[PDB]
Amino acid sequence: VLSEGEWQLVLHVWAKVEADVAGHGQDIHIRLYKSHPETLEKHDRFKHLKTEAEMKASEDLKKHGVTVLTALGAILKKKGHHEAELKPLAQSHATKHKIPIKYLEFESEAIIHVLHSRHPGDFGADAQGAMNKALELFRKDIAAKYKELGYQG
């Protein structure tokens, strides 16, 4: 459970994300696929984007990153009270896309990397710690939902 002050730090940096959701999403996904190349294989439509410039020019990838960050932002704004928002995401990621928790850890690492890169003055130790706790909670709760659906990834 996060403190109210921790949630405030999470939401303060998230408001900075929201000044450019598309660009943050692009940077996060480019970092994810570069750092952990096994992850790109779950996106059949993005496999032909072989350079960073091609990834940045893809409208499809850019739109997908807005879809991802919008869902995550809406979860974060519930400050842990997120069952209703989390269930559909667990349902598709467990039973359709088959995304292991380890890959959600990789994406979380990429989120934190991009937030520090773009917002160092608003992403010091206490804010990093708060965002880490928020993402850890998201991953803990989605893992429990994965298992409810029969998925042990």
How far CA 24 is from CA of 19, 59, 71, in Å, comes to: 9, 14, 14
**Binding residue count for ligand HEM, defined by CB under 6 A:** 15
Does residue 92 touch ligand HEM according to CB under 6 A? yes
Q: Is 132 exposed, middle or buried (0-12, 13-18, 19+ CB in 10 A)?
A: middle
Distance in angstroms (rounded) separating the CA atoms of residues 82 and 15: 19
Residues recorded for the chain: 153
- The one among 10, 49, 107, 145 contacting ligand HEM by CB under 6 A: 107
Distance in angstroms (rounded) separating the CA atoms of residues 152 and 98: 10
Nearer to ligand HEM, 104 or 130 (CB): 104
Report the residue closest to ligand HEM, judged by CB.
92
User: Mask of contacts with ligand HEM, 55-74, x by CB under 6 A?
Assistant: ------------xx--xx--
- Applying CB under 6 A, the residues found at the interface with ligand HEM are 39, 42-43, 67-68, 71-72, 89, 92-93, 97, 99, 103-104, 107
